[PDB]
Nucleic acid binder design. Structure first.
Lengths: 239, 78
RNA sequence: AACAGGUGCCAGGCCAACAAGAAUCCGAUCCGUGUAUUCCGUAC
RNA sequence: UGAUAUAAUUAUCGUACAAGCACUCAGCUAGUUAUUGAGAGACACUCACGAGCCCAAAA
RNA sequence: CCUUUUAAUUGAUUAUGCUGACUUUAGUCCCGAUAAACUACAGUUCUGCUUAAACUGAGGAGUCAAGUAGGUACAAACCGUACAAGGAUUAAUU
RNA sequence: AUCAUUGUGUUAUGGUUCUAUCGCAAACCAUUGAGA
RNA sequence: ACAGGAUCAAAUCUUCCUUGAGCGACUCGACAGGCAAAAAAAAAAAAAAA
RNA sequence: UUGCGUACAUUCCUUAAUAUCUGGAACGAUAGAUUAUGAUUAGGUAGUGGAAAAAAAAAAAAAAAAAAA
RNA sequence: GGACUCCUUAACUUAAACUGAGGAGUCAAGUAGGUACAAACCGUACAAGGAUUAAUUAUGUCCAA
RNA sequence: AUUAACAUAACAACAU
RNA sequence: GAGUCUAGCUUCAGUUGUUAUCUGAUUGGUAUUGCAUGCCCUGAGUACGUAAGGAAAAGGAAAGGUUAACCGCUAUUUAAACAAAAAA
RNA sequence: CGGCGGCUGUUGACGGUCCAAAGGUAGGAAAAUCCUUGUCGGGUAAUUAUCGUCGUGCGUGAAAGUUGGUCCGACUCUUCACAUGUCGUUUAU
RNA sequence: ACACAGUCGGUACGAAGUCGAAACAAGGUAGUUGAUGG
RNA sequence: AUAUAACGGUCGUAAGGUACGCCGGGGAUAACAGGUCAGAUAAUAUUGGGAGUUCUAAUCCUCGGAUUGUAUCAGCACCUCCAUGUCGGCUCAUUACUCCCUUGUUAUUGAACAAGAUUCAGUUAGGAACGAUAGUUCACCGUCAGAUGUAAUACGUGAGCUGGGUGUCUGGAGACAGUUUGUUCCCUAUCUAC
RNA sequence: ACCGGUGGUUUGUUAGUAUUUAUGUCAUCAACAUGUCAAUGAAAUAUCAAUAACGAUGAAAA
RNA sequence: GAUGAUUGUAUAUUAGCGGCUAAAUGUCAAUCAAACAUGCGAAUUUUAGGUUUUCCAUGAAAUCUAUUUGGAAGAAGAGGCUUGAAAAAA
RNA sequence: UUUUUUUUUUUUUUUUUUUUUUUUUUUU
RNA sequence: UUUUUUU
RNA sequence: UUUUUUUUUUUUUU
RNA sequence: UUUUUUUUUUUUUUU
């Protein structure tokens, strides 16, 4: 090429909202559908930047419609997954998670590098507020209020800047015109928690950080290490 | 159509520089700037190449020890 | 035509079982069958 | 900056010119020969002997 | 060196000439119908086609080509592969 | 002696044909050996 | 620029002359912005604070 | 009325002339040193004629040559 | 077994750069000059060769000159 | 080891 | 030296065509028209003409046709279907 | 086994004369042939295109194969019907 | 480079000083000036 | 003693076609396109005669000559050289003429009005719809009445398209239609002389 | 003077020389592919030492 | 087209002065009105291409007869060239 | 919500709309 | 640096 | 000679 | 009346 044609042709051309994909629409939709399930099952995927900016559109809608907990919404959620494992995870680990998160459960990170074999850009599509995340996420709900109160109590500048905002949240005592002293008073029960229903055993489980541990040892690799397979097989040339 | 005559050396010479500038302004310059941005972030580590590749690292080396103040190495312990 | 071979490249007198000078001077490195002078063997 | 100037080659009455070949370079490539011919008003060199000259094949 | 001779076939920008090299056109033209995933505590991705049974007493119902084309370390190398009696009664040994 | 600057001049590098004999009688001449 | 100059000398608020046309007008002097990310029919939209 | 511009000198200097007639049937001579006021001269296709060159090979003539060494 | 022009003249549409004759120049085989732009017209004391010099020719003398 | 065509580089320039 | 807005020049066709004298206190002294198809209306059944017959000055309007612009309405085609509660 | 015609007189059965082996038969006929608009009728707002017909305008011509009832059709043409971006005149995915 | 990419021709140092400028003349002193009633 | 009368003499009484056309060298397809030529012929004006017959010039027909020009026909060379009845249509266009309609109120008129005819003038302004038969185009035919509707440019236009006969090509240079940050933001640019 | 053995000359310093095979075609048939048996050097029985530099042999080298 | 002048197959025959041909000048080893290979049978051309260093002297024609006379001068003959001059004082 | 004519609007200005270029700088 | 128009 | 002047005219003969 | 013509390459007609 010439590198000038690109510029000459692009004059007075509108941008496309939805990025084109190789194949018929029926194929494209299938592709995106399957990639959504694969993204749900992993927690981070490595994809090209254009594609990473495209899959995030449905990545948000899936979680947005999964939290309604309605027959109608359930249908739409059903209409966007394939495998049962993704359904299970979405309905048992992600829904409880984003209980207090209004929106924006995903992000895109650019790698600023080119593929060796393709010379193409690369990016990561990782969920927000997940173990081993690239960067930490901000608090929401009562956590946010506590953060804000901390900020306020830290220094004068924070107090001044958050003065207006604090009023709405109720962190300012109207009876004395000062920041609330006790912040735990604004604690409320969240949806994620378990409502109240109202031993000397040797087989008792042991507390541990993600899931408990059994009092017995089982000779078994992790879930991700008990099923091996060759990634790729060479194809001999036929001269 | 078909060419009527042969192109002179001068024309070719001109074309060379034209093309070089064209390419430099649009490919090379963009690539350089994109490359240089990655420095801030840790190097890239590939899982596939783990069989032979060196362990991961974060810290970057200094190519110019002449302008490198502060300690360079630590004394051995007793 | 002493082109009869070889020896670091042009040898009658050096190797080649039988004749005849490690001959003298000159030589960029650099051996040097080369220039100049001269002796000898020959029914080769 | 001033003045001045119609690539080359063959044919043709015609520099004929909007006809034929050639991007460039390297190697090869087109008047060869009188034991048998010759001075003839469009062009004919020189040696020996002399009313005498040459001598063929064996050798 | 000079002088006499030479049957050398002895003389080149050109026969779209024969045998070769290297420029221009020219970073121009050319790219075959369908992919994806391999994770931070379980699982079955989508699509096209539809003769994929290997003792059951019966040699899988045939011919031809390959002058040996589905063996082998992400090898176009080296090294191997054709058993009409099926050798492992190998139901044992350790 | 017009480089205004994309030109020219010098020099250098690169490209570039590819020849080391393994041979030499049946003819002629000289000499020598046994027997007529 | 009321900046300079003359006069027995101007209503508050310069009688009159000079500045070639007060550098075409205004304004700036740490002034001005090519490329990258992101966005992007022309065009517009980001205060600084890794 | 009297004017003026303009293309071409073998004036000067250096070469050449081969089908019997350019002086020259001259001079010189041991293989010719090119004539100074010397006459005609020297555009050329086709055809014809004269002359000088083409670094090479062969040949049984590569030291009787000043000065210097 | 010839192209342009001058005089005479055959043919044709007193046509055409045609077709064909009688006798002079030029080109062909001629340089440079003039005629605005491409052989043929005018002139030439017409191109062996070299230099920074003088001349009545076609013909010119408001500017390009 | 090797000529030309062809390919790249270095130096040289000012009345501009 | 730099930012903005601009003077001059340039632009489809084409031209050089404009102002003597000067209301005496009396309601004041040229003015954005270059240009042009057809049919209908006022002027008008008037000018003209025995009769039949039947104009112009000016303006106003309904079709057809060309150029340019745009998405308020209609027609064709087509896409989207997601965050008001700080009890969330 | 090549082929088969002149003058002249009353639309003209008929009469004169020349020539020859014989002197186009019937049918078809504006034609796989003349002519790229022969008269009239059917279709259309227009038909010289095409069917029917007349048999003169030129002419073809019988086991040289002529004519053709019925049946038949990858053979020309007329004409009817449905849908239709062929179209005035071009759009969207 | 306008050029079939050529040819001819092609730039005239000092005062950029100054304690000079004297054996012309005049002179508003400027190292000034020389003719002319249309 | 015949022939050579093709009589400078071999006639030996020995002819035609090829649309099946290969090879060699030349530029001519059976109207000889273009350029040149200007016979016929076209434009303006003029004269003779005949219409309008009261009247030679409101207006019309025809003849001779002169100037300008060459649309068309014939002829066609020594010049030129592509492929055809020496184009039919589609797309896209440029130029000239007082050019079909719109202008010159008001004297050229056999012009009462209306509707009409010939000629001339600008600073060159706005406009002009279709169909059937395919007999290469002309007289005429039917509809909206857009209201009597000519030439040149290689048939204008075939490396833009094509059709029932009176080949192919991926755009190197000109032109035309779009587009171009800059003094710097690729590299380099090293006085004077003790 | 046959016949055996040895040596020299000419042909021939002036003339030239080919034996193996990759590729075309059904066949006939056609055909000069790719420097040398070869690092270089007279001699490798001179190619030593190695870590940069300086060092060794050789006429010449890293 | 597909119940028939259906399709398909091992190995075979017809050879250029030829054979094949439900007859086209259609086909016989992917341009056959007469195939391909070889040739010391060593291929012919009034057409046409090419033809290699300099200097000097001299210097044409496109006209005629003949060839049943042509055309883009073919062949043969004739014609056309070096003959002369041009150096002087009572 | 977008595009388009099959819809709608104009048929005026030409010293107008618009624009890449401040020029007393005669040898950068 | 124009000429001519008898008596 | 007078802006008289789309094909219409006046004055003066310069 | 004359000098000024195809001077028809351009300007100019300066008489």
């Amino acid at each position: 090429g010439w590198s000038k044609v690109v510029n000459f042709l692009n004059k007075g051309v509108q941008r496309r909202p939805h990025r084109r994909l190789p194949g018929q629409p029926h194929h494209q939709w299938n592709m995106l559908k399957t990639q959504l399930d694969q993204l749900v099952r992993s927690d981070r995927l490595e994809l090209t930047l254009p594609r990473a900016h495209e899959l995030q559109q449905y990545a948000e809608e899936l979680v947005h419609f999964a939290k309604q907990n309605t027959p109608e919404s359930s249908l739409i959620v059903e209409s966007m997954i394939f495998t049962p494992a993704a359904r299970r995870k979405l309905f048992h680990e992600l829904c409880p998670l984003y209980a207090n998160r209004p929106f924006f459960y995903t992000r895109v990170v650019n790698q600023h590098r080119l593929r060796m074999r393709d010379a193409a850009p690369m990016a990561y599509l990782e969920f927000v507020d997940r173990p081993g995340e690239i960067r930490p996420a901000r608090p929401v709900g009562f956590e946010r209020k506590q953060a804000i109160w901390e900020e306020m109590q830290a220094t004068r500048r924070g107090r001044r800047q958050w003065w207006n905002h604090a009023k709405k949240l109720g962190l300012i005592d109207e009876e004395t015109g000062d920041v609330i002293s006790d912040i735990n008073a604004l604690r409320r029960p969240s949806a994620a928690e378990w409502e109240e229903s109202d031993s000397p055993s040797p087989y008792k489980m042991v507390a541990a950080p993600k899931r408990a541990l059994e009092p017995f040892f089982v000779d078994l690799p992790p879930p991700t290490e008990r099923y091996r397979k060759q990634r790729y097989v060479f194809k001999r040339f036929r001269p | 159509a078909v060419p009527k005559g042969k192109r002179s050396k001068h024309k070719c010479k001109q074309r060379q520089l034209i093309y070089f500038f064209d390419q430099f302004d649009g490919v090379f310059k963009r690539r350089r700037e994109s490359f240089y941005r990655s420095f801030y972030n840790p190097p890239y580590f590939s899982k596939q190449t783990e069989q032979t590749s060196l362990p991961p690292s974060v810290l970057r080396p200094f190519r110019f020890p002449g302008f490198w103040p502060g300690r360079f190495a630590f004394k051995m312990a007793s």
